[PDB]
């Protein structure tokens, strides 16, 4: 069993990797990797 998640919403088999705060929304590796959130701000490991 495992139908709970907040992966990404197109990439379904690949889950969020952290949180674009210039855009002010969560993203995953292959969104910074395909994407344009390479150069984009985050925030890693929860303070
Ligand atoms: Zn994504
Ligand atoms: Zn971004």
């Known amino acids: 069993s495992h139908i709970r998640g907040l992966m990404c919403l197109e990439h379904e088999d690949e889950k969020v990797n ?14 910074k990797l395909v994407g344009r959130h390479r150069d984009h701000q985050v925030a890693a490991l929860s303070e």
């Open 18 to 31: 952290m949180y674009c705060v210039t855009d002010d929304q969560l993203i995953c590796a292959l969104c």
